[PDB]
Amino acid sequence: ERIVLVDNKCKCARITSRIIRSSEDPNEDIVERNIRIIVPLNNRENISDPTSPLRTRFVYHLSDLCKETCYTYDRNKCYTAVVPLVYGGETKMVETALTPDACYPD
């Protein structure tokens, strides 16, 4: 019944809207603004560099996500970083997988 205005998935906001066809009086129908933020609370600031500080401020300007610094990983998009792991002589900098089950190559 409702229409998704915003389905932003790197802050995880999800503003929708819906006209409530009321008790059958005149046009005293209401319109909604069902915001649904989901706050990470253990993701870092730089989402891809996991050696960063945690987070305190979560700022949601809901114009600037109706038209960046993402707070959550997106599920389908896959994230990486590069670490210096060694094994013997060399420091072979190979490419990890921050979120797995999404970085599986075809």
Binding site: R75, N76, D101, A102, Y104, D106
Partner: protein, 498 residues
């Protein structure tokens, strides 16, 4: 909405086994992410009974396995040794238990002569008797209200609830069983016997299709119902079926251009194509065979169940191509990028009760004779599309035009030609050594070129360019030939000459 889709209602007797498939949009996350089957209890949450990573709970140990077919795009849960604690409310899903991405199966276990028929068929109620009554008033009565009501007597009475549709062998054959008549009868000659008749409602045959894709309902019925007027209703929110096709004529104001009722076989196994499925097609469909093409009782129906997922990988081609009369259209039909090496085709539209789609062109070469000179199937751009250019338009060649392919999984894209009134965007002589072609200034970036049309398409023919000419003008210094434009890799306005 969450795009998993399973069976909404499952019924199976204790001791027997269950196979529950649940489908997912075959992404590369959804192929590899964790797939669960949790028991939504009361007071809270899922308790994962059998995950797909390899957990199998204390309860379901030894009796369940969850497998995963990622190319088929589904995962299947086999559960043997049911009991009546296996009844209740379950979810099949992906990822974490809390975050949705799931579907809600309702498992419902049941406790264990006799007959078990599907709707509208025959059945032969058989009853033994003794030799001392071999001429007596044999009969069949129905047990409703703690008293046998009369159904079949010997002398020629049949009930108003059971009029005419039943004859008498001893035994007795009833025909056109409807679900209200699924009764537990009794037969009498002084001996008796009971008689039990369950009539099942034909189960869903889950069809998880795609947004802007297409679906093929394979309606297979029997030699009793070959010449009966087959249909496809769509059982909506009450009890009524707002019919969608017929064989005696009808179709819908909705499904214009899209339903293709294929011809009958010798087995009566006609098939139905719907294309361009939108989000409001996502429910139970029902092919059937009654006379007057509406859903009535006595009709051997055979349902389905669609689901049109919204997480498509199908690209969004424009549905309405607007061409001016005697102008040009140039449409792109998308096709599966894996299935690049296959034989393209094209089509017209001719109604649903006809349900026709005859072949205009292909990629091997054969064009219809009444379209020669004005029609060319292309291949550029590749890597996903194939283009068809049609010019020299007409008021009556507007319609619905289907982009077939000889591939395995098919998106029969339908594109709609709107022949408006108009003027040609390109000026060419009437019917004609140098031939000119006069291009507007909007095509400034576009590359101006002539073709030699055949069944093989366009081969290049040189020319020399001028300066400002009342825009652009090109020459044909030197069957049917055109002077179209080209924008990088796509194609635009072409006009034909003799």
């Amino acid at each position: 909405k969450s795009p998993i889709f399973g069976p909404e209602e499952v019924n199976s007797v204790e001791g027997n086994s269950v196979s529950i498939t649940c489908y997912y949009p075959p992404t590369s996350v959804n192929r590899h992410t964790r797939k669960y089957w949790c028991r939504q209890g009361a007071r809270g949450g899922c308790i994962t009974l059998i995950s797909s990573e390899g957990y199998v709970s204390s309860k379901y140990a030894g009796r369940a396995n969850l497998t995963n077919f990622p190319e088929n795009g589904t995962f299947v849960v086999n559960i043997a040794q049911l009991s009546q604690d296996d009844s209740g409310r379950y979810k099949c899903g992906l990822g974490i238990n809390s975050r949705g991405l799931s579907f809600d199966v309702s498992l419902e276990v049941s406790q264990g002569k006799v007959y078990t028929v599907d709707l509208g068929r025959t059945v032969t109620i058989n009853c033994p008797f003794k030799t001392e009554n071999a001429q007596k008033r044999k009969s069949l009565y129905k047990q409703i209200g703690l008293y046998p009501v009369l159904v079949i007597d010997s002398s020629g009475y049949v009930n108003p609830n059971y009029t005419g549709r039943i004859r008498l062998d001893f035994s007795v054959v009833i025909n056109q069983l409807r679900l209200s008549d699924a009764g537990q009868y009794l037969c009498q000659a002084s001996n008796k016997k009971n008689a039990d008749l369950q009539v099942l409602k034909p189960e869903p045959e889950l069809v998880y299709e795609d947004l802007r894709g297409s679906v093929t309902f394979h309606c297979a019925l029997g030699p009793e119902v070959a010449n009966v007027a087959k249909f496809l209703c769509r059982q909506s929110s009450g009890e009524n079926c707002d019919v969608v096709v017929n064989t005696l004529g009808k179709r819908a104001p909705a499904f214009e251009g899209r339903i293709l009722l294929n011809p009958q076989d010798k087995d009566g196994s006609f098939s139905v194509v719907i294309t361009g499925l939108r989000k409001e097609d996502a429910g139970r469909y029902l092919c059937g065979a009654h006379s007057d093409g509406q859903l009535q009782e006595g009709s051997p129906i055979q349902a389905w169940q669609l689901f049109v997922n919204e997480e498509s990988t199908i690209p969004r081609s424009p549905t309405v191509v607007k061409g001016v009369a005697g102008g040009s259209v140039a449409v792109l039909c998308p096709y599966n990028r894996k299935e690049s090496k296959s034989i393209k085709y094209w089509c017209l539209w001719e109604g649903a009760q006809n349900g026709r789609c005859p072949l205009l062109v292909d990629s091997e070469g054969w064009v219809k004779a009444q379209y020669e000179g004005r029609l060319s199937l292309l291949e550029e751009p590749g890597n996903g599309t194939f283009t068809v250019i049609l010019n020299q338009l007409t008021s009556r060649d507007a319609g619905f035009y289907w982009c077939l392919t000889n591939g395995d999984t098919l998106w029969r894209t339908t594109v709609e030609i709107k022949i408006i009134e108009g003027e040609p965007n390109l000026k060419v002589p009437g019917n004609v050594l140098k031939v000119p072609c006069h291009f507007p200034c909007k095509f400034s970036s576009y590359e101006k070129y002539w073709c030699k049309w055949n069944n093989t398409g366009c081969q290049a023919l040189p020319s020399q360019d001028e300066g400002p000419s009342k825009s652009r003008l090109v020459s044909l210094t030197l069957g049917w030939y055109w002077c179209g434009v080209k924008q990088g890799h796509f194609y635009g306005e072409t006009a034909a000459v003799y």
